[PDB]
Amino acid sequence: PPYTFRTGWALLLLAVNFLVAAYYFHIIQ
Amino acid sequence: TLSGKTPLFAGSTGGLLTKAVEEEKYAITWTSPKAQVFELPTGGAATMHEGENLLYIARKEYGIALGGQLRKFKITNYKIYRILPSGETTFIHPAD
Amino acid sequence: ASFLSSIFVPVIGWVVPIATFSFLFLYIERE
Amino acid sequence: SISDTQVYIALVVALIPGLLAWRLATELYK
Amino acid sequence: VQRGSKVRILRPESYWFQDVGTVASVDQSGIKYPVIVRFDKVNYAGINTNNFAVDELIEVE
Amino acid sequence: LGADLTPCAENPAFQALAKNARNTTADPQSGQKRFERYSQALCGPEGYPHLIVDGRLDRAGDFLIPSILFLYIAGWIGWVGRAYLQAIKKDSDTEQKEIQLDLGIALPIIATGFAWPAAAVKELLSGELTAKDSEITVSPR
Amino acid sequence: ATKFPKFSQDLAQDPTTRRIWYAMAMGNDFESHDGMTEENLYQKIFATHFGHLAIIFLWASSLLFHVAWQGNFEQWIKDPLHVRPIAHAIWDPHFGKPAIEAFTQAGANGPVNIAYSGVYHWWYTIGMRTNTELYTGSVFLLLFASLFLFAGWLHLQPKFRPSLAWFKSAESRLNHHLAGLFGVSSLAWAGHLIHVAIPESRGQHVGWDNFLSTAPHPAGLQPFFTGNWGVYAQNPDTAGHIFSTSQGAGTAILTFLGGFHPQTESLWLTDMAHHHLAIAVLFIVAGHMYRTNFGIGHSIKEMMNAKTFFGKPVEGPFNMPHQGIYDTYNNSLHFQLGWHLACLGVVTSWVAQHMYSLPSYAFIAKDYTTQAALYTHHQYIAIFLMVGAFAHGAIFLVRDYDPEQNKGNVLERVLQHKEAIISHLSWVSLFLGFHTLGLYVHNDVVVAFGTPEKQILIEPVFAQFIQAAHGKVLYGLDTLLSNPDSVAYTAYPNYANVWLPGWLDAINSGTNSLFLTIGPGDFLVHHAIALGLHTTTLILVKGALDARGSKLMPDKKDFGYAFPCDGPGRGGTCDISAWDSFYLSLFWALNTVGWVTFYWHWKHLGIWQGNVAQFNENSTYLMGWFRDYLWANSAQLINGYNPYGVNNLSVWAWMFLFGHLVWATGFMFLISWRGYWQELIETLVWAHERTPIANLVRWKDKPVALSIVQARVVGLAHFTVGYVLTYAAFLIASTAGKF
Amino acid sequence: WLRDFLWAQASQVINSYGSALSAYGLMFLGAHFVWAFSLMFLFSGRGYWQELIESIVWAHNKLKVAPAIQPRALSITQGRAVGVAHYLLGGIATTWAFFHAHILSVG
Amino acid sequence: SHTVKIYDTCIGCTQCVRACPTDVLEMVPWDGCKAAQVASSPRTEDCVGCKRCETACPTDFLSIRVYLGAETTRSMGLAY
Ligand code: CLA
Ligand code: CLA
Ligand code: CLA
Ligand code: CLA
Ligand code: CLA
Ligand SMILES: CC1=C(C/C=C(\C)CCC[C@H](C)CCC[C@H](C)CCCC(C)C)C(=O)c2ccccc2C1=O
Ligand SMILES: CC1=C(C/C=C(\C)CCC[C@H](C)CCC[C@H](C)CCCC(C)C)C(=O)c2ccccc2C1=O
Ligand code: SF4
Ligand code: SF4
């Protein structure tokens, strides 16, 4: 099956990985 | 009793120890076809007699390690006893 | 009262192991 | 430092756990 | 099964657990594990044959 | 910038190391041509180029360019070695061909696999890349 | 046929000297004693825990008494920055007269040992000023340790002996220990700081006589009950506060400046007072959560066995099966002991990480050797607590674990995919080691060939950011509390960053260990640390998961935890047991903490001497570690005694050689194994029964060689003791010889 | 023996970077490595390393890179033999690189 | 002494009886296997823990197993 509960939290954590890099790349300030 | 001949060697420092007085002592008898040179598990070479032999050994491990060495002499008659210091001789090898 | 070092250190250096080892040796070798 | 008298009070008070440690270590068995 | 049938092993303590064997001979009455399976890879002892029960195997051919 | 990173072409410490260049190869100006290329890096307070593994496209030559060049090669070392072990499993000996290389089978495997990113996705999407967990030996739990 | 050991009839019927050695290493193992039942187990461990608790108070009382009677605490108050503390005094008869003159130091009459454990800084901070308070607190701990020695005796008597259900009442420990042991004690220490330690910090004596008369605040508990709590944060100790004097003093008792005191370079005592007060409220509220006999609160066994999230059926909490884990934690004692050592092992290193950067003791940032020893001490303590976490976790899987009670849950699903855990742990250990060792050897060859610019130097740009996302201007990243236009800098809806003007003063000064400046030399060592953590974990997890059997040897649970091998068969099985994977890991765990404390020590030898350029150039290649740290610093140490004389470092010069000898002795038990030595002792048994006068005497226990599992203990014991004593003699004297 | 021989005479072997004795500086450190590497074979046993390969053969069985010649750990006698050959190599080569760089400088 | 457990999977190979050097093992008749005999260990007070008997057994996994127990004088292998 398409693992909804697994990929739901992995994409949440990876969105935290991309948010902190936006501070480091000065995209968000 | 046991009533066997003692093989020809000049004595070893292996031999028997204080356990042979205190806890137990084993003894292996075999009837040899002829006189020839074999090895002692105590260490060194010896010379068996013709007819019934006897070797007072320290442990049961020695007599079955020796009996495998006697098997290549066409000697499959070896019988180990367990000689307790109270004089109690127990036939242990073989089971029958 | 720094003289108590002269009376506690040799007791713990000498008398304490002699009293302990001679008790334990006679206790482990006790049928 | 502390006085010479106060060291002996500390030694006599230290016999109270020294007695109780001998009672606990022998109530826990031999 | 029969002499030449690929089977699988479900005995957990065995070395070839969940591996493909080849039945070499099946006995008739005794032992309780009457199936000789000639494996293709060797265990740590170096051998590649063993005895297995009738219900122990999974036929894959 | 960067940080604690002035460019190497602006550092007096890097230009002091420029005046005492040691020649790498027997090329007599190999000590000098080394430092005209290191002038674009970022040398700190010591005069040594500090690399940037960030992903910045002005510092892509440090780690972004050699990572693509490595992963094409080292995956191809392991892709060829995977396709050869698939081939010799379906043979009569299967252990002679491991120590004593079947060179007539090995050389078609070596020359083929340079398009392994075009290959290794096709085994993935078809599921032939992996094996079933009901077909691999496992330890008693 | 003796009656020793009492706890085993199988050991007491051993004619050899194996009887003696296995009594020692099975004595405190209460679970393998003869006839030990379940409720008798807990009742004996609980009273034993009063025995170890009372050793701690008797230990801490000798720290107070040997300082009050033999140290120079009252002479250390006058000038803590140059007066060198004293631990205890030497009475050694074997001394020569130049070795009494060398240890007569720190202004003393006889030979004294300079204290490098920093307990003068902790006692001076918390208010103690004269030698009588040290003696009074010493005598109090004699009575307070005897109050636990009596308590352990009392709770072994038959109607005072607790039942089995009292021990397995886990929801009632969590309410009492969180609210009372954690929360009230944090509340009580906040009461000690505000009533005593903060007024002692202002030249104002508050003792047992006048603490009921004097108030900590001239407002005096009226702003507490009325809700005007901002009165407690009035005029603080200013930036000209000379410590323990009235100059620049304040009236505030709960303040929130953040950062450091300007003279002592420690945390403000008013900051610690609002800290342990706020910790106390968060824990008393946390201790009113679980269900006890009052019919209210959460129930952990119902939280595990829950299967329904607001009507939606799930597998458990986080849709993960946690059923049976309550009957797995609570029924087993090795699951608890293996767990809480991991909890205590995390915080022990976490203590050490936050005490060099955030000093909390007066004048401890300038007494260098006391600070270099406290980091390395609690790091090695954190090492054993983490190795024993996996060790006692793996005794659980052999002995206590039941797969039927634990069927289908999350701890069962780890044992299914355990070959995927060990494989990806084996990957990262090899992926780091092949490329971290590769870059040191690359930098070694490149510097050796006279062209050091060809080094592969990587700035740690992902930890450059965090130090600039905490407020360091020195790199110029300009984000997140270093960007003064940030939402995080201003706290946009409420603007309540009270801590932040005092935090940014501390982090932007180059005169402390707060967020040290990092460079390319620090890149390689943190990836060398990550090599050591993933590899030590590899050995411990694989020994935990394969503890119940595998392909080479199934049913390893039938042989217990520590057994030598299974013979030379199947290729041999040397070091196969789950104990043997404890054993291999403590070489790595001592190694990794070497790396984290060689790197700690040499970065601070540049800060303390003003030479930061020596570390940043030379810590990229492994000769600069070997030359500029190991070779160059051991010149003060090794000249502790030479044919010209001695000095005060001659113990540490002697202990350094002593450590090299205990370390090397432990190789003999590990390279050479047993069967060489049993064939050697059988020649000494011969030549004692033949010697004519000396065979009047004879052994009672037959001499046999040390067993296989035993001289891996004894081999690791000489290895670990020599590893500790060698570095601890190098850490002290290379720092206490240079200052 | 530690101060005036091992410490004092090694000041020519570790200070030899950027000069012609650089290889003896690299063989001094490089032989300290191989000596320390040998202890992995001497201290540990065979039966640990066979268990570890079983978890690496699994990840090699999963992606179908299973070798036909099965991996085994080194035998008990060989693990001792590897551990003494790497021991004697790194211990002598330490001294080889220490005697040369000291005596090619003061001679 | 030690403990010698013999499971029901062996085939009567007589390789374990011909390898135990203190002669602990012996064959008894047993109608199960093809060779119609199973190994038996009636003299386990003589066993020295050698594990020669586990090395010589063919069957996977081993039908014979030696559990190392309390070590008396006969199982330590002491001539003194
Ligand atoms: C465990 C704690 C501890 C330790 C390691 C030390 C260590 C030392 N003390 Mg000290 N001492 C302590 C507590 C301690 N003290 C306490 C609480 C008191 C107050 C009674 C004293 C009173 C004292 C005096 C008066 C003198 C010393 C001296 C000494 C030194 C020599 C050893 C000796 O003679 O012991 C002396 C021991 C005693 C007087 C009684 C011991 C008291 C403690 C409570 C017993 C602890 C036993 C321990 C817990 C048992 C566990 C053993 C362990 C291996 C499992 C040495 C520096 C001598 C010294 O300084 O020489 C230069 C000296 O003259 N000590
Ligand atoms: C056919 C080649 C091949 C392939 C595709 C793989 C693939 C894999 N190995 Mg493996 N391995 C191999 C050979 C191979 N291995 C050999 C020969 C050894 C013995 C040295 C190992 C030892 C090994 C260990 C110890 C580990 C892996 C791991 C892994 C996995 C992650 C990749 C990695 O860490 O590389 C690891 C690579 C090495 C350790 C060195 C590579 C070996 C040589 C240099 C390459 C082989 C090339 C081959 C001989 C060419 C033959 C060509 C043919 C036409 C003749 C992956 C499943 C890891 C794992 O389980 O992760 C999940 C892991 O921990 N392997
Ligand atoms: C409010 C009541 C209360 C209190 C105060 C305690 C207190 C305690 N119980 Mg307890 N208990 C209670 C109720 C209570 N219990 C109830 C109701 C039950 C039955 C359900 C139990 C059942 C029970 C058992 C079965 C056991 C205990 C044990 C203990 C002791 C824990 C070990 C210890 O001293 O750690 C002290 C820990 C702290 C003071 C907190 C440390 C916090 C972290 C680790 C460090 C933080 C410090 C910080 C960093 C600063 C330090 C720096 C400074 C030192 C310089 C401790 C004395 C154990 C014991 O040893 O028995 C004697 C034990 O075996 N209890
Ligand atoms: C508070 C923590 C704690 C507790 C309660 C226990 C409790 C226990 N552990 Mg555990 N353990 C711990 C921490 C703890 N451990 C840590 C931190 C580690 C990692 C190092 C381990 C590793 C470990 C292993 C590997 C094993 C245990 C075992 C045991 C059990 C029996 C202990 C025994 O036989 O003692 C006997 C005590 C000794 C043999 C002491 C000898 C070692 C001493 C300390 C050497 C000291 C050297 C010397 C004095 C230095 C002198 C210096 C001088 C020369 C200058 C018992 C349940 C054993 C077991 O079977 O569990 C059921 C077992 O196999 N534990
Ligand atoms: C320039 C010098 C240099 C050298 C000498 C090495 C040498 C080595 N590297 Mg390394 N590496 C380098 C630069 C270098 N690296 C750089 C610049 C990068 C960044 C891209 C990496 C990234 C890298 C990875 C990610 C891995 C290695 C591994 C290895 C070892 C085996 C490589 C191989 O081909 O095995 C033969 C190949 C196989 C047996 C199978 C192929 C496995 C390859 C390496 C992975 C590719 C698969 C896939 C496309 C990517 C996986 C995901 C990944 C992004 C995480 C070997 C010691 C491997 C290792 O440590 O294994 C233990 C490994 O996994 N290296
Ligand atoms: C030396 C050695 C022996 C022989 C050593 C023996 C039998 C003991 C030697 C020490 C004697 C008994 C004196 C002990 C004195 C200690 C220095 C301190 C003892 C005090 C504690 C026990 C409290 C082995 O039997 C052995 C077996 C397996 C692997 C390695 C070895 C091994 O290395
Ligand atoms: C590492 C180690 C192993 C495992 C080590 C092994 C299996 C040796 C593997 C090392 C070599 C380098 C692997 C070579 C594999 C291929 C033949 C080479 C592939 C690359 C080619 C181009 C050569 C043991 O089995 C062992 C046993 C007993 C005591 C200590 C140890 C021990 O330390
Ligand atoms: S235990 Fe082994 S040797 Fe004995 S009969 Fe069975 S298979 Fe043969
Ligand atoms: S213990 Fe093992 S090797 Fe020794 S006699 Fe018994 S079966 Fe044979």
Residue numbers in the entry:
A (entry chain bX): 16 to 44
B (entry chain bD): 4 to 99
C (entry chain bI): 13 to 43
D (entry chain bM): 11 to 40
E (entry chain bE): 2 to 62
F (entry chain bF): 24 to 164
G (entry chain bB): 2 to 740
H (entry chain bA): 646 to 752
Which sentences did the original study use to describe this structure?
The light energy conversion reactions are carried out by two multi-subunit pigment-protein complexes, photosystem I and photosystem II (PSI and PSII, respectively), embedded in the thylakoid membranes. Each monomer contains well-known nine membrane-spanning subunits (PsaA, PsaB, PsaF, PsaI, PsaJ, PsaK, PsaL, PsaM and PsaX) and three stromal subunits (PsaC, PsaD and PsaE). There are 95 chlorophylls (Chl) a, 22 β-carotenes, 3 [4Fe-4S] clusters, 2 phylloquinones and 5 lipid molecules in a PSI monomer.
PCC 7120 (hereafter “Anabaena”) by single particle cryo-EM analysis at 3.3 Å resolution, which reveals unique monomer-monomer interactions for the formation of the tetramer. The tetramer is organised in a dimer of dimers form with a C2 symmetry. The Type 2 interface refers to the interface between the two dimers within the PSI tetramer, and is formed between monomers A and B′. Compared with the Type 1 interface, the Type 2 interface has a smaller number of protein-protein and pigment-protein interactions between the monomers, suggesting their weaker association. These structural findings, together with the sequence alignment of PsaL, suggest that PsaL with bulky amino acid residues is a key regulator for the formation of the PSI tetramer in cyanobacteria. In the Type 2 dimer-dimer interface unique to the PSI tetramer, cluster (Site) 2 in the B′ (B)-monomer closely interacts with cluster (Site) 5 in the A (A′)-monomer, which may contribute to the enhanced quenching observed in the PSI tetramer.
